[PDB]
Write a protein that binds this ligand. Structure first.
Ligand SMILES: O=c1cc(-c2ccc(O)cc2)oc2cc(O)cc(O)c12
Length: 326
C-alpha cells in the first residue's frame, strides 16, 4: 500500500530534510525560561506554562521524560520542518539542564481550554470551524511528508477567545516514505485506525484521517471517546460493531491480511449500524446530513478510501466556514 497524495515529498527533498538522526541540536539557554505552573502530562513529558524572562512573554515548557536520542531528534526535526505552517505549534527553543541533561522543548503558549469542558459548549458552527482549522494543520503536515500519528482532542490546543487552534505533541510523528513498514504501536487506543489494529504496517497519512473521524464522531454525537475499547483487540471489536464485519472482510482480503484466530473469534460477525442510530436528543442539533456524509467518508476501514485532508476541507459540510474566510 502507498499514499494516494504526497507520496513523493521526502523523495524530492534533500536527505537533510528527513534524515533526522543526522541532526545536531543547538541548545539555547535553560535560564531564559521559568516554570510558572504545570498544565499537563503524559507518558513522555510534563508540560508547564512558563515565562521567557527576557521579554516576559508566556511560553510552554515541555520537559521530556527519559527518551532515546533518535526519538528526541525525530520530534525536533519535524517541529523545525513544520515551524510556520498553519495551526502547527511553534517550537521556539530547545534547552537542557546542565547536570542531568534533561531536555525541554520551548513552545509558543496557547491559552487552552480542556476539550472535556470546551467541546460540550461548542455550537454546530464552532465544530465546523475548529475541525476545518485542524484540517489545515493536517493538510500542511502531510504536504510536507509528515504523519502526525497521534491525532486526538488532547493534542489539539484551542484558545476559544482568539479562535486559535494548534496541533501539538509531535512526539509520535514520522516521515512518510513509500513502501516503509511502520510501528503500529502509535496513536492513542481510541483513535487507532483499523490498519494499526490488524497489523497493516505500510500505512500512511490516511491514518490521521481515521483519528480525525473518531474525534469528529465524538463531537457531533457527544460520545467521547466514540470507539471505546479496553485493549487493542476490543478496540477492533468496537469498530466492527459499528462499521460491520462484511466491510472488514473485504478490507482484509484486499491487503491479504489474516487476523489472529483469537482476534477473529472476538470480532465475530456484525451488521453495519447506520450513523443515524447514534442520534439522540442531546446531539440532535449537530447531526445533519452533511455531517453524516462527511463522517462516513472518514470512517472507512480501507485507508485508501478515506478523504485526504485537502478533500475534506472542500466538503460541503464546511461551506459556511470557507465563505467566511473568502
Ligand atoms: O499551550 C500548550 C501547549 C502544549 C504543548 C504540548 C506538547 C507539545 O509538543 C507542544 C505544546 O500543551 C499544553 C497543554 C495544556 O494542558 C495546556 C496548554 O495551554 C498547552
Amino acid at each position: 500500500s502507498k499514499a494516494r497524495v504526497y507520496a513523493d515529498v521526502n523523495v524530492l527533498r534533500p536527505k537533510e530534510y528527513w534524515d533526522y538522526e543526522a541532526l545536531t541540536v543547538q541548545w539555547g539557554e535553560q535560564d531564559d525560561y521559568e516554570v510558572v505552573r504545570k498544565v499537563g502530562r503524559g507518558k513522555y513529558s510534563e508540560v508547564f506554562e512558563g515565562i521567557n524572562v527576557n521579554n516576559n512573554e508566556k511560553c510552554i515548557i515541555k520537559i521530556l521524560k527519559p527518551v532515546k536520542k533518535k526519538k528526541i531528534k525525530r520530534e525536533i526535526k519535524i517541529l523545525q520542518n513544520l515551524m510556520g505552517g498553519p495551526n502547527i505549534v511553534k517550537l521556539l527553543d530547545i534547552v537542557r539542564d546542565q547536570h542531568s541533561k534533561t531536555p525541554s522543548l520551548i513552545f509558543e503558549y496557547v491559552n487552552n481550554t480542556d476539550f472535556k469542558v470546551l467541546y460540550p459548549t461548542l455550537t454546530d458552527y464552532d465544530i465546523r470551524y475548529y475541525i476545518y482549522e485542524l484540517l489545515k494543520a493536517l493538510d500542511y503536515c502531510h504536504s510536507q511528508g509528515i504523519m502526525h500519528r497521534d491525532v486526538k482532542p488532547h493534542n489539539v490546543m484551542i484558545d476559544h477567545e482568539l479562535r486559535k487552534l494548534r496541533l501539538i505533541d509531535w512526539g509520535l510523528a514520522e516521515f512518510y516514505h513509500p513502501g516503509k513498514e511502520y510501528n503500529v504501536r502509535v496513536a492513542s487506543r481510541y483513535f487507532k485506525g483499523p490498519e494499526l489494529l490488524v497489523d497493516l504496517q505500510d500505512y500512511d497519512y490516511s491514518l490521521d484521517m481515521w483519528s480525525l473521524g473518531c474525534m469528529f464522531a465524538g463531537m457531533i454525537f457527544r460520545k467521547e471517546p466514540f470507539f471505546y475499547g479496553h485493549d487493542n483487540h476490543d478496540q477492533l471489536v468496537k469498530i466492527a460493531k459499528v462499521l460491520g464485519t462484511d466491510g472488514l472482510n473485504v478490507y482484509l482480503n484486499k491487503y491479504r491480511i489474516e487476523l489472529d484466530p483469537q482476534l477473529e473469534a472476538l470480532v465475530g460477525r456484525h451488521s453495519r449500524k447506520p450513523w443515524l442510530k447514534f442520534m439522540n436528543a442531546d446531539n440532535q442539533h449537530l447531526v445533519s446530513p452533511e455531517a453524516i456524509d462527511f463522517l462516513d467518508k472518514l470512517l472507512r476501514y480501507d485507508h485508501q478510501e478515506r478523504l485526504t485532508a485537502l478533500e475534506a476541507m472542500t466538503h460541503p459540510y464546511f461551506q459556511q466556514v470557507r465563505a467566511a474566510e473568502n
